[PDB]
Amino acid sequence: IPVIEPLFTKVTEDIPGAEGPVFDKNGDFYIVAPEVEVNGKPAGEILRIDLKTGKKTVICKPEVNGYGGIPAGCQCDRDANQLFVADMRLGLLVVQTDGTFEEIAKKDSEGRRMQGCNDCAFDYEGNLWITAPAGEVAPADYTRSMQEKFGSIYCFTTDGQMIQVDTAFQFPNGIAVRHMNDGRPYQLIVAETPTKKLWSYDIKGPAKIENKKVWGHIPGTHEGGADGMDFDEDNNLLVANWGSSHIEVFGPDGGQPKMRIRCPFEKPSNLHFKPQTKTIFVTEHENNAVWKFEWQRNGKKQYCETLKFGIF
Ligand SMILES: [Ca+2]
Ligand SMILES: [Ca+2]
């Protein structure tokens, strides 16, 4: 398996558990710090990063009824410039760039308490697919499915329904949506970290998935596995393989990695493309920093880059 070693440039550092890199509709860059703590209690933060100086600004420190959050994944909305944030303690949050935020749901469509979320991905129809590796959200005691299989997958539909689409995962982490050339959602790819597996489902409609299958195999016997992921414009899937110093690259059909990207750090966590460029920003947990490198091509357009009132 061919391995490439591109030049990695440091952007910023000293961000505990650096995760969820994302660009909003104005081109601003944000990341989350899920591991920030105060007196032993969660006090996760959402930061805006100045790409010119690397300076950090905390715009939001989520807390609900005295319970601090553990923000871990982000997606920018299309119809409004707001961020949807998966929080391991609070569930799903919608955060405004001014720092104000709102809790999306405490229970799902079946009346069951919400589970803590880790990452999410919009499909082009506007539905948000979410991984939930933690147990019930605060005030429930914090737990995670690293050993036991109670991780779930949710879909937050355009008409506001929070539906659990599947469960029994051992720490579902990264997630991505494969689209057809016509823009129609085709497959859902979900990373199950410790098992070194990538799973796929066929998307038949909002919150409707079938044919669960082992889509890809993550290399290594190291502790960890697939974390965050994203597609490039040719539908190649780039996957951060936490613990093995590489980002794996899969072809549209999955299976075994077609290429590997060697990183100057052991723990790549998540990544995101800068709109309209080949530049990929990567968060990593060895130094808790954010880096950037040039890929071979542009990234796949995110939902927030699509037009609601477009002709073609
Ligand atoms: Ca993650
Ligand atoms: Ca991303």
Task: Report residue 22 CA to chain centroid gap.
Answer: 9
Residue 243 gets the label, from left (phi > 0), alpha (psi -120 to 50) or beta, of: left
* In the block, residue with structure tokens 């965050």: 228
Two tokens at 182? 């016509």
135 with 150: CB under 8 angstroms? yes
Q: Which two tokens stand for residue 286?
A: 């060895």
Distance CA 63, CA 43 (A): 8
The answer to whether residues 85 and 46 touch, using CB atoms and an 8 Å cutoff, is yes
307 CA to middle of ligand 1, Å?
28
Distance CA 119, CA 19 (A): 9
What resolution (Å)?
A: 1.9
Distance CA 44, CA 38 (A): 9
Say if residue 287 is exposed, middle or buried (CB neighbours under 10 Å; 0-12, 13-18, 19+).
middle
The bound ligand whose nearest atom lies closest to the alpha carbon of 118 is: 1
Sign of CA dihedral 224, 74, 55, 61: negative
CA trace torsion 285, 290, 251, 180 (10° rounding)? 120
Nearest to 28 by CA among 308, 303, 281: 281
Contacts of 271 (CB under 8 A, 6+ apart): 21, 228, 229, 230, 238, 240, 247, 280, 281, 282, 283
* Method of determination used here: X-ray
Closest to 85 in 3D by CA, of 65, 54, 64: 64
CB 254 within 8 A of CB 197: no
Q: What is the 3-state secondary structure (H, E, C) of the chain?
A: CCEECCCCEEEECCCCCCEEEEECCCCCEEEEECCCEECCEECCEEEEECCCCCCEEEEECCEECCEECCEEEEEECCCCCEEEEEECCCEEEEEECCCCEEECCCECCCCCECECCCEEEECCCCCEEEEECECECCCCCCCECCCCCCEEEEEECCCCCEEEEEEEECCEEEEEEEECCCCCEEEEEEEECCCCEEEEEEEEECCEEEEEEEEEECCCCCCCEEEEEEEECCCCEEEEEECCCEEEEECCCCECCCEEEECCCCCEEEEEECCCCCEEEEEECCCCEEEEEECCCCECCCHHHCCCCCCC
Q: List, in sequence order, every residue forming a beta bridge with 86; answer none if it has no partner.
A: 73, 92
Q: Which long-range contacts (CB under 8 A, 24 or more apart) does 296-300 make?
A: 296/232, 297/232, 297/233, 297/234, 298/232, 298/233, 298/273, 299/230, 299/231, 299/232, 299/233, 299/272, 299/273, 299/274, 299/275, 300/179, 300/230, 300/231, 300/232, 300/233, 300/235, 300/273
Provide φ and ψ at 88, rounded to 5°. -60, -20
Distance 20 CA to ligand 2 centre (A): 7
Provide CB contacts within 8 A for 68, sequence distance 6+.
Answer: 38, 41, 42, 43, 44, 61, 62, 89
Rounded to the nearest angstrom, the distance between the alpha carbon of 72 and the centre of ligand 1 is: 6
Binding site: what residues are annotated?
A: 19, 118, 173, 227, 230, 271-272
Task: Give the sheet arrangement for strand 82-87, strand by strand.
Answer: 71-76, 82-87, 91-96, 101-103
- In this structure, what token pair is assigned to residue 192? 């199950």
How far is 5 from 101, CA to CA, in rounded Å?
Answer: 39
CA distance 82 to 103: 13
Distance 180 CA to ligand 1 centre (A): 25
Length of the chain: 312
> Residue 177: nearest ligand to its CA?
2
CA of 20 to the centre of ligand 1 (A): 7
Measuring CA to CA, which residue among 161, 252, 271 is closest to residue 205? 161
Write down the domain spans for the chain: 1-312
Tokens of 41: 């209690």
Q: 173 C-alpha vs ligand 1 centroid, how far in Å?
A: 5
Please provide the CATH number assigned to the domain covering 1-312: 2.120.10.30
Burial of 307 (0-12, 13-18, 19+ CB in 10 A): exposed
Ligand with the closest atom to the CA of 119: 1
Ligand located closest to 30 CA: 2
Residues assigned a catalytic role: 285
Binding-site residue positions for Ca(2+): 19, 118, 173, 227, 230, 271-272
3-state SS, one letter per residue, for 179-239:
ECCCCCEEEEEEEECCCCEEEEEEEEECCEEEEEEEEEECCCCCCCEEEEEEEECCCCEEE
